[PDB]
Subunit: 124 residues, 3 copies
């Protein structure tokens, strides 16, 4: 019933947490930053980090037995809401309608100096 | 199975998201800002925006077949914690006991220059 | 649906309940580093973070579970430089497998706290 997901197709945790926890058909995916999992280096710039975040989330979704289509809620933390338009473009490029529920805020800073962090909840 | 919730009585999404997603008895409501749902203009000042956020959430609750009494968790983002006392007053005016679980933080900024965003989870 | 309330954890400082349990899932309110006996914040980041874990653990137990049932934590810091000690406090208070997590630096927290942690359990 409860599984702790761990796949090296997504970035290793950079703190004391697991990549995702699945309970029943619900999955809680940790905040993902724009790391290339092979190097654990952030991509350069907001757009590349946001695209990488989606790759990272997708890899965890698949290791949890689902896909991005199973996301019901995303929580987005940006360090600059000037990036909101490109955020929305990256969402369109990676998702199909109907889109999940979402929240979005500008924070002061993010782990490892990322400029975008996205958390996810799935129902598979 | 997922059901996406939409109502013209709440603001249209200002980004790539749905107003809410329902899975069984659980509903994930997107962050709501203090927009008038017809004009998409923010109300003037914190109190009016907070009251409008509650009207927007209530509309989505009703579209999902529930009410504010079904909220189990609110997540509040403020741009000024000086508004905390009035936030708590607006909560009392709009809710009956038992109150939901909550978190509240001061963020750096919110989309479109709002001063309050509230996300909600229901169990109907 | 149960609204949890135990004075082993801090009283709510606003219009909310400590936690709500629905079925197997528990939503625990954001906790700050208050000593429940005095409703005063502990002094400094590390003491507040340790107290937050005591406060969350008390609510977990009042909800019929334990810290081992947490599936997700959401951490709000007022300074990213506290991230290293945050992770040390997590190791000291949790056993593997660790819950999922998110963490950000916010501008400020209620009552001048320097850390707030929200929790979701599955019991």
């Amino acid at each position: 019933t409860r599984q702790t997901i761990q796949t090296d197709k997504a970035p290793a945790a950079v703190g004391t947490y697991s990549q995702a926890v699945k309970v029943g058909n619900t999955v809680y995916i940790s905040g993902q930053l724009g790391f290339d999992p092979e190097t654990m280096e952030l991509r350069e710039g907001f757009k590349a980090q946001a695209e990488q975040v989606f790759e990272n989330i997708k890899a965890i979704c698949e290791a949890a037995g689902g896909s991005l289509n199973d996301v019901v809620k995303f929580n987005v933390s940006l360090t600059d809401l000037s990036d909101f338009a490109v955020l929305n473009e990256v969402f369109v490029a990676n998702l199909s309608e109907p889109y999940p529920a979402r929240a979005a805020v500008q924070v002061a800073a993010l782990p490892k100096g990322g400029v975008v962090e996205i958390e996810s909840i799935l129902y598979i």
